[PDB]
Design a protein around this ligand. Structure first.
Ligand SMILES: Nc1ncnc2c1ncn2[C@@H]1O[C@H](COP(=O)(O)OP(=O)(O)O)[C@@H](O)[C@H]1O
Ligand SMILES: Nc1ncnc2c1ncn2[C@@H]1O[C@H](COP(=O)(O)OP(=O)(O)O)[C@@H](O)[C@H]1O
Ligand SMILES: [Mg+2]
Lengths: 78, 467, 306, 347, 74
């Protein structure tokens, strides 16, 4: 199972962070995750999204040559 | 703070809350990698009790490597827990395809994986000496086991070529096998007079290790004429991969790059044949090619490559291939993510970088979609033992000992070759000393030194002394 | 002359590769430290070593002299570096673009001029390498990666014929073919892939070449008879050595079996040639210190001029 | 008497100055012919292995494959040595003089040739060879010229086998394909290996045996066609036995049955398998792990392993022909070696 | 011929002439300028040649390349 990148290991920090992301996402407020590149922001955010039954996942990865067309097309998918 | 990240205005962060996700502490990393090593050691239950020392050793070694080698020394010393995760995955894929394991063999396997995931990016020789001292300290602190041999990179040669399983192999047997297989490779492919030495054996082993993993990509950093792409072609011929070579001249644009990428992707998916993509430094003219590599590597494919009629014919070809293999896939999402799984499983990209101090090379190695998802291999310059071995192997053909040569009593550090007995060792030492003095006196600084001058001088020397 | 072969031959192999792209002062200093390194490791070498007198014989020296090359020693050494690179393709860096005519005179009508800025470059290049004509390329600062297999010489020996792939298909090559690259701008950036695989030779003119050229002009003008005498003695010494070698071969072929007047005449001619050689050596022994006095005399003008 | 297994130790060692490439057997006298990488063709005698009978240098380049056959007219011996000098050579053995007698050299290949075969069907001897020219070539031994040249594959074929009027050809593009001999039409194509095919040969008929699972025909179509089962050896460390399908009997390919079928796969070699030679119930094969293995057809497991037979790569094996009544299958088998040695097992 | 030698493994014979030239007939290299005295061969193959020129040169024979390459001289 360690080959699959979606596997998470629950500790106190990631469960406290999952609680805060649920609290802010239920508060209709934008959330900005800003940390060093090894902190696993994408992994913990997908962990909070996929295990839940109240939120969904869209795959958007920004780049230098990215406009609102990609965002709008990803919006039409769901 | 790092370059490539444009600071956004406060008007966008006005309406959004902000968080800082710091690095996990020692206890959290320790517990997470206890869980990882318990999962890995479930394969071999005889060493189940060693889960705590291995996780403690990995966490402490990562912390020491982060504290010692910083960003100030080199721009690519950005360590992360992702390297620890890659270490765990490498240990798993070595144990799973390995023989009956032993405690000494397990420690050697972990040491080899740490060598190939943690200190294959180091530059200075004293940095590698500090790393092997760190390995000695970590092993003697957390795994107090005797009867353990050398942990240096020459004595840790784990290969899958010589057997059916990932196991340690003898040095001379591996050297003979590489010699004969490279002779067969030169017979069956392009011919190049490459000499065999232990540093290239270690490099060819680590690039074979990197090119056998699922979604395995790496970037090779080293001076020119070090022999990078020939080693890449040698491994990709050993593993049955197909070489695709981007033939890009000066009168080239993004259309040729896109059509080569499209042909490679179509041959990877529809024809189900694995391919190796050697992206050279000179093959990236503008930043659009770097953006295309970012899209191809951070994700699994390029969504911008197939649009409209191209997208429709791609989906038609994917449906035809799925119906040919008799797989019940109907929705477009299943076909698309099966296709990107096929691309991520059957496409390996490698990079050859000549001068890392260039602005284009700095932008390449500072890219966020390249540094994290590729194994940084630093070939660097040639150390003195490699030069001595190459010169000894190249001057032995010609008769050279025909003069009354007396042994000169010189200093210990002034002799790089094993101590002088014949005129050949003196000639090799003279050549290496002149090369070092010449590269010192031209003020090369920290730029890599291309060893092609040494090989050209050796060839001219043997031809001229023959005449 | 045999106990120091490995010391003199290792200098010239060093001299070909490392010293292609240096000025006179740095080249002299590196030769000094090379002599120091050779003397340190107990490898003997000729104390009166001269690279032109080591590799460049008189015939090739004249043949280079009336093809357009100047009489400077630095240009002669660089030309010897260029025309003794059998394995590595040479690179020419001359701001004046003077020596295109030199290689055209040396290779005759076989010289075909090509440029990286052309549009039919690939077709005429593949036709020329199928023929085997010598090819000279201009605009070396605009290197095009389509000749990456020609620069690295990664030919595959497919059967009895040697094979290369250029561009997008298969072309055949011949043993007559030789490639040359010429560049105009000295400050033009060169790719590292091209730079590390060619013999980069600098045909430029620096302040040390100002000193050398002013020395050459003041010796060929102030005391021209001395330079004429030096050239005459060198030419007669070479001619007498060749004649003595030919006479020795003829004498050995005549007297290999078993006396007559033919052997006695050959012995008398050999005695006369040996006496002439001894007289020439005695004359030339006491002439170099005059040149030493001249070079100790005409250095203040060089310092003033620089 | 067909279930002989060679002993563990070599009977005697044959010393060669360079790398041994192809080894053959004389079907009447105990004489072995040993190739070299230097191109020299030897002829050792098993009783006295001190000096060769006739050391003839025929080519400036290496030689790759051989074939030997004692003809039966309605007689003498023919040795062919395919080489790397763009041509092949044909030799005749003289028993009275004990020296090689050259006959002719067949030309036509535009690259180096890697396979050669010689046989007879009805009072006419034919020679086949296959090269890096991607084309299968045929010759007439008495006439001297070719009959049919054709390319079956995009990449270059490596090894072949033949009986009657059917030719299969392993290729560098990891695909097998039967090529019909008169018509030149590909009856069936095969896939399933992951590496180029080193050696490949047919499995033929036998008269009487207790029980067979890999040589006996199943139906009357197999019985009168006579071509049922083939075994292929390829660089993916595996040996497989392949079912060949029926044609639309010039025979036509079957549109729904023009694909091969792998029946039994064998694995355990530590490097590339190089050559195979079936002998009754036992599939003798080599590898590049300094070893020669013995595989059974029925149980599909290696009964005997010969570990560290040489200090280097093992190149080629060859046996005596057993599916014909002209030549008895004597209990002799000899191997080659990259480390300049050749070993023969007897009794 | 001043000395005769034979290959102990393959059918090769080494012949040394009185003028110093050595021929390998189943190659022609002049190991010593003067007349050679005697030779010895031991199995890599090393051939030691001694002559009257106060210089003993040792040469090795490459079986695959059919050429002799000198290793060292006393
Ligand atoms: N709490 C945790 N549980 C499991 N794995 C973790 C945890 N924290 C970090 N990791 C590891 O750290 C790595 C961070 O990778 P990634 O999510 O790509 O970083 P980022 O999100 O910054 O791009 C992952 O491979 C993950 O396995
Ligand atoms: N001992 C050696 N080590 C490294 N390179 C060598 C050696 N001998 C020759 N070479 C040269 O190196 C070239 C291959 O290096 P390559 O990987 O192409 O360098 P780069 O990666 O800078 O393009 C060959 O063309 C060959 O001429
Ligand atoms: Mg991140």
């Amino acid at each position: 199972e360690v080959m699959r990148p979606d596997i998470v290991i629950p500790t106190i920090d990631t469960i406290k962070h999952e609680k805060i992301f649920y609290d802010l996402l239920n508060s209709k407020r934008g959330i900005i995750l800003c940390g060093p590149p090894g902190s696993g922001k994408t992994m913990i955010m997908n962990n909070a999204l996929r295990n839940s039954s109240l939120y969904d996942v869209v795959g958007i990865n920004f780049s230098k040559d990215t406009t609102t067309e990609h965002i709008l097309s990803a919006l039409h998918r769901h | 703070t790092d370059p490539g990240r444009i600071p956004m205005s406060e008007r966008f962060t006005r309406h959004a809350a902000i968080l800082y996700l710091g690095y996990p502490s020692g206890k959290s990393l320790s517990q997470i990698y206890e869980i990882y090593y318990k999962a890995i050691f479930k394969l071999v239950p005889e060493f189940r009790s060693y889960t705590e020392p291995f996780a403690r050793a990995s966490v402490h070694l990562y912390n020491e490597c982060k504290a010692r080698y910083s960003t100030g020394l080199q721009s690519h010393y950005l360590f992360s827990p992702r390297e620890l995760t890659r270490l765990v995955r490498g240990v798993y894929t070595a144990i799973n395809t390995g023989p009956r394991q032993t405690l000494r063999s397990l420690i050697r396997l972990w040491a080899y994986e740490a060598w190939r995931i943690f200190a294959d990016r180091l530059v200075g020789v004293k940095e590698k000496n500090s790393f092997e001292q760190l390995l000695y300290e970590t092993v003697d602190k957390y795994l107090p086991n005797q009867d353990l041999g050398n942990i240096s990179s020459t004595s840790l040669l784990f290969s899958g070529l010589l057997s059916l399983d990932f196991k340690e192999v003898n040095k001379t047997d591996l050297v003979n096998f590489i010699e004969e297989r490279f002779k067969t490779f030169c017979d069956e492919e392009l011919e190049v007079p490459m000499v065999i030495h232990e540093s290239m054996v270690d490099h060819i082993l680590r690039i074979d290790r990197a090119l056998k993993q699922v979604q395995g990509h790496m970037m090779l950093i080293g001076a020119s004429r070090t022999g990078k792409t020939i080693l890449t072609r040698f491994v990709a011929w050993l593993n049955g991969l197909k070489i695709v070579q981007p033939k890009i001249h000066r009168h080239s644009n993004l259309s040729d790059f896109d059509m080569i990428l499209k042909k490679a992707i179509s041959d990877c998916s529809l024809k189900e044949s694995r391919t190796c993509l050697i992206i050279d430094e000179s093959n990236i003219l503008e930043t659009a090619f770097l953006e295309r590599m970012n899209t191809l590597l951070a994700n699994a494919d390029i969504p911008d490559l197939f649009q409209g009629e191209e997208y429709d014919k791609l989906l038609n070809n994917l449906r035809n291939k799925t119906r040919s293999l008799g797989l019940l896939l109907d929705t477009e999402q299943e076909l698309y993510d099966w296709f990107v799984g096929e691309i991520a499983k059957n496409l390996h990209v490698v990079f050859t970088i000549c001068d890392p101090t260039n602005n284009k090379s700095s932008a390449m190695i500072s890219s966020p979609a390249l540094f994290n998802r590729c194994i940084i291999n630093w070939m660097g310059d040639w150390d003195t033992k490699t030069m001595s071995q190459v010169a000894n192997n190249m001057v032995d053909v010609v008769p050279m000992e025909f003069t009354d040569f007396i042994v000169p009593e010189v200093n210990k550090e002034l002799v790089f070759t094993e101590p002088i007995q014949t005129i050949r060792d003196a000639v090799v030492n003279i050549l290496i000393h002149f090369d070092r003095n010449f590269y010192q006196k031209m003020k090369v600084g920290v730029n890599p030194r291309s060893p092609g001058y040494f090989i050209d001088g050796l060839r001219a020397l043997v031809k001229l002394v023959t005449a | 002359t045999s106990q120091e072969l490995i010391g003199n031959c290792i200098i010239s192999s060093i001299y070909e590769t490392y010293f292609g792209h240096l000025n006179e002062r740095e080249r002299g200093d590196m030769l000094v430290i090379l002599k120091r390194l050779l003397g340190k490791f107990a490898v003997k070498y000729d104390v009166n070593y001269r690279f032109i007198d080591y590799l460049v014989t008189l015939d090739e020296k004249m043949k280079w002299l009336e093809c357009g090359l100047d009489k400077n020693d630095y240009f002669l050494e660089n030309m010897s570096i260029v025309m003794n690179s059998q394995d590595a393709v040479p690179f020419l860096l001359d701001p004046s673009s003077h020596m295109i005519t030199v290689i055209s005179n040396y290779y005759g009508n076989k010289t075909v001029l090509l440029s990286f800025l052309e549009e039919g470059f690939v077709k005429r290049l593949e036709n020329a390498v199928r023929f085997g004509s010598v090819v000279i390329i201009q605009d070396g600062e605009f290197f095009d990666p389509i000749i990456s297999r020609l620069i690295s010489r990664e030919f595959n020996h497919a059967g009895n014929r040697v094979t290369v792939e250029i561009g997008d298909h298969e072309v055949d090559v011949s043993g007559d073919f030789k490639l040359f690259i010429h560049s105009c701008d000295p400050s033009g950036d060169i790719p590292i892939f091209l730079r590390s695989r060619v013999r980069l030779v600098h045909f430029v003119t620096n302040k040390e070449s100002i000193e050398t050229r002013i020395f050459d002009i003041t010796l060929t003008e102030e005391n021209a008879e001395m330079q004429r005498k030096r050239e005459d003695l060198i030419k007669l010494n070479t001619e007498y050595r060749l004649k003595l070698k030919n006479l020795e071969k003829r004498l050995l072929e005549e007297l290999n079996n078993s006396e007559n007047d033919e052997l006695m005449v050959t012995l008398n001619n050999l005695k006369k040639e040996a006496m002439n050689i001894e007289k020439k050596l005695s004359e030339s022994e006491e002439f170099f210190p005059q040149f030493d006095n001249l070079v100790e005399e005409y250095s203040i003008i060089g310092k003033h001029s620089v | 008497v067909l279930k002989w297994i060679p002993r563990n130790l070599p009977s005697c060692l044959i010393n060669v100055e360079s790398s041994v490439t192809s080894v053959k057997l004389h079907p009447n006298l105990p004489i072995v012919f040993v190739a070299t990488d230097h191109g020299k063709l030897y002829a050792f005698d098993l009783f006295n292995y001190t000096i060769p009978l006739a050391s003839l240098q025929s080519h400036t380049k290496a030689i790759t494959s051989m074939d030997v056959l004692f003809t039966n007219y309605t007689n003498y011996l023919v040795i062919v040595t395919a080489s790397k000098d763009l041509q092949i050579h044909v030799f005749k053995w003289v028993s009275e003089e004990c020296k090689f007698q050259q006959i002719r050299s067949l030309l036509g290949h535009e690259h180096i040739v890697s396979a050669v075969k010689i046989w007879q069907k009805n009072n006419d001897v034919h020679i086949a060879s296959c090269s890096r020219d991607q084309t299968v070539k045929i010759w007439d031994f008495h006439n001297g010229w070719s009959l049919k040249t054709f390319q079956p594959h995009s990449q270059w074929v490596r090894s072949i086998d033949v009986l009657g009027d059917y030719i299969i050809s392993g290729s560098h593009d990891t695909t097998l394909r039967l090529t019909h001999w008169p018509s030149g039409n590909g009856l069936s194509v095969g896939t399933g290996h992951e590496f180029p095919i080193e050696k490949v040969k047919f499995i033929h008929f036998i008269e009487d045996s207790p029980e067979i699972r890999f040589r006996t025909p199943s139906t009357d179509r197999y019985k009168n066609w006579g071509m049922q089962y083939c075994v292929s050896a390829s660089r993916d460390r595996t040996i497989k036995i392949w079912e060949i399908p029926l044609p639309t009997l010039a025979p036509i390919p079957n549109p729904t049955d023009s694909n091969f079928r792998c029946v039994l796969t064998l694995k355990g070699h530590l490097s590339w398998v190089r050559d195979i030679s079936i002998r009754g119930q036992y599939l003798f094969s080599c590898a590049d792990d300094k070893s020669v293995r013995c595989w059974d057809l029925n149980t599909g497991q290696c009964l005997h392993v010969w570990e560290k037979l040489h200090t280097g790569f093992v190149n080629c094996l060859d046996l005596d022909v057993d599916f014909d009544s002209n030549v008895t299958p004597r209990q002799m088998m000899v191997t080659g070696g990259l480390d300049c040695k050749s070993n023969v097992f007897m009794r």
